[PDB]
């Protein structure tokens, strides 16, 4: 992977990615404005970095997010396209660090950093299963 | 609202809050281990803080998350209870900050900070309408 390379991921926000859809179990979030949820924006930043990393993993490997540190500076109604730009900051062993940004065609809506760790999917799955009640 | 006061929120993780469920749109996430998604954890931490701050709201008001900065230090399969602890760090006018931390009864699973802004619901909604395609 090359540090400083930018990757973009575009995503038309559908009606089902607003706040209330993140937790249909939450009465608070049921009155919230119909805008893209910060937890969906975080998933979309992860998705961008997963796609960027994919060509570089060995077969059987995946990754997990290990930190996210971002602002959310404008809100985005469904129908706009959120573009995430991910730029690789460093790779050290299994750890990849990213500078991430997102824009909805109107406003910058968020920026910060994200870190991930490469994992062996099958081994990690087995470990999760052993944690599972 | 008192700085240093803690609020806690418990959540049993159901099967439908795993990674593949955050973006069923995403073939990239399709075959991921069945663990609580970071975007869902982010939503839970926001939810914890929304609940902590409900007494601060005037009628007509709501809040928006404006930053999240957390680590994810362990993964949580469905069936475990995630407890989020939201410790108020600052409250100044429209702006509130918490230290958030989460544990799944087995492991510490992440911590960091979350910031929110009080909003006037009707005004905000008008602003969102004016950028709705």
């Amino acid at each position: 992977m090359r540090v400083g390379e930018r990757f973009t991921h575009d995503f038309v926000v559908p009606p089902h990615k607003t706040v209330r859809h993140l937790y249909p179990e939450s009465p608070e979030f049921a009155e919230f404005p119909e805008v893209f949820a910060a937890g969906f924006m975080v998933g979309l930043m992860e998705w961008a970095c997963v796609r960027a990393m994919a060509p570089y993993l060995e077969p059987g490997e995946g990754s997990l997010g290990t930190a996210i540190c971002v602002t959310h500076t404008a809100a985005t109604p469904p129908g706009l396209t959120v573009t995430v730009t991910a730029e690789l900051r460093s790779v050290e062993g299994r750890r990849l660090s990213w500078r991430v940004s997102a824009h909805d065609g109107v406003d910058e809506i968020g920026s910060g950093t994200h870190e991930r760790a490469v994992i062996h999917l099958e081994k990690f799955n087995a470990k999760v299963r052993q944690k599972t009640p």
Side-chain angles (χ1 to χ4, degrees), chain A residues 42 45 67-71 98-100 111-115:
Chain A
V42 167
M45 285 176 163
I68 181 81
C69 190
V70 288
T71 60
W98 301 87
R99 199 293 130 46
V100 285
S111 88
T113 54
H114 180 228
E115 285 80 47

Side-chain angles (χ1 to χ4, degrees), chain A residues 1-2 4-9 48-49 51-53 55-56 83-88 98:
Chain A
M1 290 212 66
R2 51 167 203 97
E5 182 164 333
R6 292 178 282 174
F7 304 93
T8 57
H9 182 252
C49 303
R51 281 182 65 201
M53 286 168 56
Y56 299 91
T83 299
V84 173
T85 301
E87 177 170 5
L88 178 69
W98 301 87

Side-chain angles (χ1 to χ4, degrees), chain A residues 16-77:
Chain A
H16 61 275
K17 301 294 195 195
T18 59
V19 176
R20 58 192 255 256
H21 290 276
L22 190 73
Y23 277 91
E25 53 270 87
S26 170
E28 294 76 28
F29 281 171
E31 7 153 5
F32 269 56
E34 285 288 66
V35 299
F36 194 46
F40 283 127
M41 180 184 72
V42 167
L44 186 63
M45 285 176 163
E46 298 203 272
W47 189 356
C49 303
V50 166
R51 281 182 65 201
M53 286 168 56
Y56 299 91
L57 296 202
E58 293 305 322
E61 294 185 333
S63 58
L64 293 176
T66 64
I68 181 81
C69 190
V70 288
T71 60
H72 195 192
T73 54
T76 299

